[PDB]
């Protein structure tokens with residue numbers, strides 16, 4: 001939790017000619033993210049790329065999570081495209097965050113497109129992914145597609161929970 005001290009040592013090591021590496025940057029970017037200090041995490045991320053330190057999936061996940069949380073979806077999507085271009089493979093956490101963020105932003109057609117894509121890449125969606133999409137479809141009156149996803153999740157052995165059922169029961173009832 002002691003971020004201002006960690007940052008002090010970080011500055012100290014650079015001043016002593018000890019070169020930070022991907023672990024150093026990751027730890028700090030994560031800590032900064034969790035501390036609300038997203039802009040500072042992003043500055044460290046820029047810096048690590050200038051120094052030739054290559055970010056990894058943990059780096060991208062942390063920033064995308066932070067940006068998604070903050071509603072900064074255009075920038076979260078920029079990082080997502082960048083990570084795929086660098087051949088850093090996104091994982092279920094990356095997609096969940098984006099589909100959730102695009103969810104909350106009511107950009108539902110884009111969330112469904114990412115959902116399609118994650119399945120093409122072999123990333124297995126989880127109950128959170130399905131719940132977000134089914135909720136979004138449910139609220140838009142797109143009941144038939146919500147029911148297809150509900151059927152799909154059961155078929156894949158993802159077990160629905162009470163919010164999944166509520167959403168659908170609500171739709172069938174008031175629609």
Ligand SMILES: [Mg+2]
Nearest residue numbers: 039042043046
């Ligand atoms: Mg920036």
Ligand SMILES: [Mg+2]
Nearest residue numbers: 046075078079
């Ligand atoms: Mg940029």
Ligand SMILES: [Mg+2]
Nearest residue numbers: 078079081082
């Ligand atoms: Mg770019």
